[PDB]
Amino acid sequence: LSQEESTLIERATATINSIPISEDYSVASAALSSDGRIFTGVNVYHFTGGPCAELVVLGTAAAAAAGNLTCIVAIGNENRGILSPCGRCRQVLLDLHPGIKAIVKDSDGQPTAVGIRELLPSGYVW
Amino acid sequence: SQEESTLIERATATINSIPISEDYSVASAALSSDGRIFTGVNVYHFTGGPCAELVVLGTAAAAAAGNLTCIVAIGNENRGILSPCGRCRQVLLDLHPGIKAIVKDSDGQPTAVGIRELLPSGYVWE
Amino acid sequence: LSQEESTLIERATATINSIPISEDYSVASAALSSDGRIFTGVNVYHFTGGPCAELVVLGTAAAAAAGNLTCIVAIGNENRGILSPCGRCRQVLLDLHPGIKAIVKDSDGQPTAVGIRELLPSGYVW
Amino acid sequence: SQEESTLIERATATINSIPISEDYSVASAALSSDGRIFTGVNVYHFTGGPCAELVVLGTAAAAAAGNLTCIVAIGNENRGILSPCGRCRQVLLDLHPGIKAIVKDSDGQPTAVGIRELLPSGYVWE
Numbered sequence: 001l002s003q004e005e006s007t008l009i010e011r012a013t014a015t016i017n018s019i020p021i022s023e024d025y026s027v028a029s030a031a032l033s034s035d036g037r038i039f040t041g042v043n044v045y046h047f048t049g050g051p052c053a054e055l056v057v058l059g060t061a062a063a064a065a066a067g068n069l070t071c072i073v074a075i076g077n078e079n080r081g082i083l084s085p086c087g088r089c090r091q092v093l094l095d096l097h098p099g100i101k102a103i104v105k106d107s108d109g110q111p112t113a114v115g116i117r118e119l120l121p122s123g124y125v126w
Numbered sequence: 127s128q129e130e131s132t133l134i135e136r137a138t139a140t141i142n143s144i145p146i147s148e149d150y151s152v153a154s155a156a157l158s159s160d161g162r163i164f165t166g167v168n169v170y171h172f173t174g175g176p177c178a179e180l181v182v183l184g185t186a187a188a189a190a191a192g193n194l195t196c197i198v199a200i201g202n203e204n205r206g207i208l209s210p211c212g213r214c215r216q217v218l219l220d221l222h223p224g225i226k227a228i229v230k231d232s233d234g235q236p237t238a239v240g241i242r243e244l245l246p247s248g249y250v251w252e
Numbered sequence: 253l254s255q256e257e258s259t260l261i262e263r264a265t266a267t268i269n270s271i272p273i274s275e276d277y278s279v280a281s282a283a284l285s286s287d288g289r290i291f292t293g294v295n296v297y298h299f300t301g302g303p304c305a306e307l308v309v310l311g312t313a314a315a316a317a318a319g320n321l322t323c324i325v326a327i328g329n330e331n332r333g334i335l336s337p338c339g340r341c342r343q344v345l346l347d348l349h350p351g352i353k354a355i356v357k358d359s360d361g362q363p364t365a366v367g368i369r370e371l372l373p374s375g376y377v378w
Numbered sequence: 379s380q381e382e383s384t385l386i387e388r389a390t391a392t393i394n395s396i397p398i399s400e401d402y403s404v405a406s407a408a409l410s411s412d413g414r415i416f417t418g419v420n421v422y423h424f425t426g427g428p429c430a431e432l433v434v435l436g437t438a439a440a441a442a443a444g445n446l447t448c449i450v451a452i453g454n455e456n457r458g459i460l461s462p463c464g465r466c467r468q469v470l471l472d473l474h475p476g477i478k479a480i481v482k483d484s485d486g487q488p489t490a491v492g493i494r495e496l497l498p499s500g501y502v503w504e
């Protein structure tokens with residue numbers, strides 16, 4: 001319902017729907033920075049651990065000296081909507097942006113922002 | 127080459143435009159067949175945070191860049207050109223088989239080398 | 253308190269304490285199979301995503317046609333005790349062994365077996 | 379060579395001793411300086427599940443094998459020898475710089491090749 005939430009979802013959705021359907025690049029992500037910017041990116045699939053969209057976003061933000069990221073979401077291609085961050089993404093997000101929130105779907109399938117720590121209970125502290 | 131220098135210059139500007147960091151310490155820049163340039167910075171993590179080159183691949187994909195023809199990585203602390211790691215070579219060989227990577231030759235001078243030459247008898251993923 | 257729990261912890265602990273102190277190999281893991289076997293392994297640290305001990309254990313079990321794994325634990329070197337599985341390990345465990353439990357420490361720092369799904373709420377379904 | 383054939387034979391027996399699987403489809407066997415042989419099977423996962431070779435590295439480390447001198451990977455479906463992937467070459471070059479890998483030559487016959495030759499102008503991690 002949030003304007004910030006709807007906008008992030010919109011940017012990620014528009015990003016994935018603007019590229020050709022691909023099995024290598026099938027998810028887009030968008031994150032909001034505390035200094036007033038939004039960074040996007042798409043995943044790179046590879047058996048050796050190609051980065052999820054969220055990790056591409058982290059590198060894109062870093063390249064712009066974005067600093068602290070407060071919220072991030074991932075949207076799947078072919079109108080799949082919000083995709084929950086995988087376990088590796090949660091670990092990287094927790095270690096590099098502990099104050100970040102991730103948008104996921106609740107029981108009713110409605111968008112909801114959750115603290116990263118809640119997505120990774122008793123998380124490993126690197 | 128003009129295109130070569132262009133990527134080196136862009137990646138160098140990128141890493142020199144962000145705070146010194148152990149998490150974000152390398153920048154990369156790639157050239158697409160259409161002539162566009164894409165950049166990115168690595169995201170270090172023990173679970174396999176993406177190298178700058180992989181962030182670049184995802185950034186280009188988010189822009190529907192298509193095929194990439196050349197890519198280089200520049201390290202912080204004035205280290206200069208860094209040869210692509212083994213994982214990067216595999217991902218590049220699988221997603222952009224015709225791409226070339228810039229590395230330092232015997233005399234420490236930059237040069238463009240085909241991906242296949244950097245991964246002889248390479249494993250071809252199906 | 254469980255005998256099965258104490259034994260897994262013991263096997264993992266004995267495994268890590270039997271090798272030279274290393275920054276590359278610093279954690280051991282042990283998992284129980286439904287067919288009556290216990291598999292161990294140590295991590296392999298690498299920036300490209302060297303496998304955590306638990307992933308080495310998964311490959312070791314697979315090599316023995318172990319089948320279904322029911323419980324797994326990780327023990328750090330230098331008497332660090334039980335280490336919670338990282339986010340990537342949780343994702344791999346969920347996708348390859350959905351019925352498995354992981355031993356982690358509770359508020360009182362006491363060993364406790366938890367369902368993998370509880371360690372990865374609203375988990376991404378590959 | 380006798381040692382060569384030994385690794386090939388061991389890895390072949392390993393992959394042929396487990397159920398056909400898309401998650402566990404390659405076996406690897408390595409030789410240590412002391413003469414011991416270590417095996418393992420890959421663990422496929424998009425977040426970067428370990429290749430069989432990395433599982434082998436962790437298995438050897440759990441036995442305090444020390445330095446590894448040679449390693450090979452054998453694929454299921456009677457595919458035979460598989461060249462080590464780019465990520466594997468990087469990890470091998472960083473943790474076992476003097477190791478050699480068995481690959482198929484021009485005539486498709488097995489041969490031992492130094493890791494450095496498989497990763498020319500390789501990135502050296504610090």
Ligand SMILES: CN(CC[C@H](N)CC(=O)N[C@H]1C=C[C@H](N2C=C[C@@](N)(O)NC2=O)O[C@@H]1C(=O)O)C(=N)N
Binds near residue numbers: 023051077089378
């Ligand atoms: C044959 N092949 C493989 C196809 C394979 N089915 C692709 C696949 O499953 N990709 C997925 C891998 C990562 C990605 N993903 C998942 C969770 C996330 N929210 O953290 N962020 C993210 O980017 O989601 C993709 C997704 O749902 O299409 C090739 N690409 N060649």
Ligand SMILES: CN(CC[C@H](N)CC(=O)N[C@H]1C=C[C@H](N2C=C[C@@](N)(O)NC2=O)O[C@@H]1C(=O)O)C(=N)N
Binds near residue numbers: 148168178211501
């Ligand atoms: C303590 N710590 C770790 C510090 C560690 N020394 C960082 C490090 O070595 N990072 C490296 C990881 C990836 C990156 N790299 C390497 C090869 C490449 N050309 O493919 N592309 C690429 O981006 O190069 C970085 C580099 O040389 O500083 C933390 N960040 N917390």
Ligand SMILES: CN(CC[C@H](N)CC(=O)N[C@H]1C=C[C@H](N2C=C[C@@](N)(O)NC2=O)O[C@@H]1C(=O)O)C(=N)N
Binds near residue numbers: 278297341
């Ligand atoms: C300089 N350097 C890096 C040193 C670095 N500090 C090592 C490090 O942090 N390793 C960690 C990486 C993975 C491992 N780990 C974590 C969570 C797990 N339960 O899922 N399973 C697992 O094996 O835990 C190790 C641990 O706690 O020592 C080198 N190795 N060269």
Ligand SMILES: CN(CC[C@H](N)CC(=O)N[C@H]1C=C[C@H](N2C=C[C@@](N)(O)NC2=O)O[C@@H]1C(=O)O)C(=N)N
Binds near residue numbers: 249252460
């Ligand atoms: C649908 N799916 C994916 C199926 C996929 N085709 C599996 C696949 O290609 N796996 C490969 C991933 C790693 C492995 N591999 C590659 C190079 C190596 N020499 O370094 N060592 C190694 O173990 O080789 C396997 C291989 O050739 O079957 C699932 N498992 N769910």
Ligand SMILES: [As]
Binds near residue numbers: 113
């Ligand atoms: As939000």
Ligand SMILES: [As]
Binds near residue numbers: 129195196226238
């Ligand atoms: As070039």
Ligand SMILES: [As]
Binds near residue numbers: 324353355365
């Ligand atoms: As248990």
Ligand SMILES: [As]
Binds near residue numbers: 379381447448
């Ligand atoms: As050999």
Ligand SMILES: [Zn+2]
Binds near residue numbers: 052085089090
């Ligand atoms: Zn992810």
Ligand SMILES: [Zn+2]
Binds near residue numbers: 177178210213214
């Ligand atoms: Zn790399």
Ligand SMILES: [Zn+2]
Binds near residue numbers: 304305337338341342
């Ligand atoms: Zn892990």
Ligand SMILES: [Zn+2]
Binds near residue numbers: 466
């Ligand atoms: Zn590999």
